[PDB]
Design a protein around this motif. Structure first.
Motif, PDB file in Angstrom:
ATOM      1  N   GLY A  73      -9.808   5.381   0.398  1.00 41.32           N
ATOM      2  CA  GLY A  73      -8.679   5.359   1.329  1.00 41.32           C
ATOM      3  C   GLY A  73      -9.073   5.924   2.680  1.00 41.32           C
ATOM      4  N   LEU A 133      -4.998  13.788   0.222  1.00 43.19           N
ATOM      5  CA  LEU A 133      -3.962  12.787  -0.066  1.00 43.19           C
ATOM      6  C   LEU A 133      -4.551  11.388  -0.232  1.00 43.19           C
ATOM      7  N   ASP A 189       2.291  15.179  -5.964  1.00 40.71           N
ATOM      8  CA  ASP A 189       2.411  13.878  -6.640  1.00 40.71           C
ATOM      9  C   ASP A 189       1.660  12.753  -5.914  1.00 40.71           C
ATOM     10  N   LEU A 190       1.337  12.979  -4.640  1.00 47.24           N
ATOM     11  CA  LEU A 190       0.630  12.008  -3.802  1.00 47.24           C
ATOM     12  C   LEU A 190      -0.867  12.285  -3.657  1.00 47.24           C
ATOM     13  N   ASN A 216       4.796   1.464   0.220  1.00 46.41           N
ATOM     14  CA  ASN A 216       5.306   2.713  -0.333  1.00 46.41           C
ATOM     15  C   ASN A 216       5.097   3.823   0.696  1.00 46.41           C
ATOM     16  N   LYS A 243      -6.705   8.423  -1.521  1.00 49.45           N
ATOM     17  CA  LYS A 243      -7.433   8.027  -2.723  1.00 49.45           C
ATOM     18  C   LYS A 243      -8.896   7.802  -2.344  1.00 49.45           C
ATOM     19  N   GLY A 255      -4.582  12.247  -3.818  1.00 51.93           N
ATOM     20  CA  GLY A 255      -5.540  11.226  -4.240  1.00 51.93           C
ATOM     21  C   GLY A 255      -4.956   9.849  -4.510  1.00 51.93           C
ATOM     22  N   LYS A 256      -3.805   9.548  -3.910  1.00 48.17           N
ATOM     23  CA  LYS A 256      -3.114   8.276  -4.160  1.00 48.17           C
ATOM     24  C   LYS A 256      -2.784   7.446  -2.915  1.00 48.17           C
ATOM     25  N   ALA A 257      -3.044   7.983  -1.728  1.00 52.40           N
ATOM     26  CA  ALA A 257      -2.701   7.286  -0.488  1.00 52.40           C
ATOM     27  C   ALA A 257      -3.805   6.319  -0.070  1.00 52.40           C
ATOM     28  N   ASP A 258      -3.429   5.069   0.188  1.00 51.57           N
ATOM     29  CA  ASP A 258      -4.342   4.091   0.780  1.00 51.57           C
ATOM     30  C   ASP A 258      -4.639   4.472   2.228  1.00 51.57           C
ATOM     31  N   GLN A 304       0.811  -1.218   0.000  1.00 53.90           N
ATOM     32  CA  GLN A 304       0.000   0.000   0.000  1.00 53.90           C
ATOM     33  C   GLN A 304       0.846   1.270   0.000  1.00 53.90           C
ATOM     34  N   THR A 305       0.226   2.363  -0.436  1.00 53.42           N
ATOM     35  CA  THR A 305       0.823   3.690  -0.345  1.00 53.42           C
ATOM     36  C   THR A 305       0.350   4.342   0.949  1.00 53.42           C
TER      37      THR A 305
END
Ligand SMILES: Nc1ncnc2c1ncn2[C@@H]1O[C@H](CSCC[C@H](N)C(=O)O)[C@@H](O)[C@H]1O
Ligand SMILES: Nc1ncnc2c1ncn2[C@@H]1O[C@H](CSCC[C@H](N)C(=O)O)[C@@H](O)[C@H]1O
Lengths: 230, 230
Positions: free
Chosen positions: B140, B135, B105-106, B65, B137, B108-111, B41-42
């Motif tokens: 998430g 941050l 860059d992060l 990540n 997703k 809407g991408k963090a679990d 996971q991020t």
């Protein structure tokens, strides 16, 4: 639990610490001098504990008509024993600071009505200030100095509070007793409103409530009033 | 003075204590497990300090990540050194939890977006939760665990707080740092309203704030939310 009286082993531990640290009473004695304490006066000490203040005051003012009042029967016993050990004929009474019961002979006859490090423990704070003003003679003064809730500290006050907590050694469970007395303490506005409410019943010519630290080691609230002239 | 970042000798002392007390992180790790943390996971750790949590999580989940963000350049330096010493290839960034800057860059991408024992220090608590939710997703989760003002303790909570303060030894000035963090901490209502405010801008499927102690040693606030599914 929030309980008013200090009893049993806690009262004994309190006395062991208090009797060996008379310097802690310096700030309060100075306030009494500022309030106009003098030899020959009638002085009532509400929530007197194990009588440390009484022994101190009687030494400086041997002709004071001094009476200590406490809700704890253990404290009254200890205070009497302590006074006897110090070679002093002091009077202590069992009683509630929130009621005149047992103090009717002193009603309107006290030059100075005082309380130190106790009013924060009470359930009915305005009732205590009511008793104070009714015990005070016209033109007499009243003075409380007691703990404030930590929410009322600034950074310096909070640092001082932590430093006080860190002192060592504490007798038995006196640290948590001291700390919880703060947890359960009134806010500045509670003290302000309590005195104001009492002053509406028994008129005063002067009233002042403030927080500072002039010796005890942590900031404490001071509540002063002067009962109106006759 | 109330200052957000922990820097200089205090940052170094914080790390010396943290690196020899991994057990203190157990409660938070369990919350992350309950939140659904898993290998690969991020995960973004806001206000990451000297990287203790990152090393713990990386050891358990080697393909996570992980990105740690801190306002203190000293903490970022220390965290990188510590990660290297522990043989973990981790990323740390200089940044502010109250802004998306440097984390674009992060977005809407963090679990999972997490923060431990830091949000109590912040000036704009709603901005921090806004950054958390942005941050994350869709689907998430975000999780804060941090200090509450002592006014929000009940007696058991306050006793625990005193007991924590009484722990020995403390490194350098870390006791007063820890204690003042509580002096300056938000109330429970502040946390609840801050997260609510953020959730109105970034919709959530779930939202809850509570206080308990499941291991750290003193009651702390927990703030959990899951960003609405895509
Ligand atoms: N309602 C009440 N009436 C009288 N005394 C009370 C009271 N509630 C608490 N107390 C007493 O207040 C004391 C607090 S300890 C302080 C003792 C003393 N004034 C000193 O400065 O050393 C305890 O002895 C407790 O029994
Ligand atoms: N606005 C902000 N943005 C990012 N980090 C911040 C911040 N304000 C304070 N911090 C950081 O929050 C940290 C508090 S100490 C807690 C560190 C770590 N999360 C742990 O649990 O061990 C410090 O490293 C401080 O520099």
């Amino acid at each position: 639990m929030k309980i008013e009286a200090i009893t049993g082993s806690e009262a004994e531990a309190f006395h062991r610490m208090g009797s060996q640290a008379s310097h802690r009473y310096d700030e309060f004695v100075d306030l009494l001098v500022g309030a106009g304490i003098a030899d020959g006066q009638t002085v009532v000490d509400l929530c007197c504990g194990s009588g440390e203040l009484e022994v101190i005051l009687s030494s400086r003012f041997p002709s004071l008509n001094l009476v200590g009042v406490d809700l704890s029967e253990d404290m009254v016993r200890i205070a009497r024993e302590y006074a006897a050990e110090q070679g002093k004929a002091l009077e202590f009474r069992h009683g509630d600071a929130q009621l005149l019961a047992g103090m009717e002979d002193l009603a309107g006859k006290a030059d100075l009505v005082v309380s130190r490090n106790a009013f924060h423990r009470l359930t009915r704070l305005p009732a205590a200030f009511d008793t104070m003003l009714r015990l005070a003679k016209p033109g007499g003064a009243v003075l409380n100095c007691s703990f404030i809730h930590p929410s009322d500290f600034d950074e310096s006050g909070f640092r001082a509070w932590v430093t006080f907590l860190n002192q060592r050694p504490w007798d038995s469970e006196m640290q948590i007793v001291w700390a919880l007395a703060h947890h359960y303490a009134p806010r500045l506005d509670d003290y302000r409103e309590a005195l104001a409410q009492a002053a509406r019943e028994t008129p005063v010519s002067e009233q002042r409530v403030w927080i500072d630290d002039q010796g005890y080691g942590v900031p404490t609230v001071k509540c002063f009033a002067r009962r109106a002239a006759a």
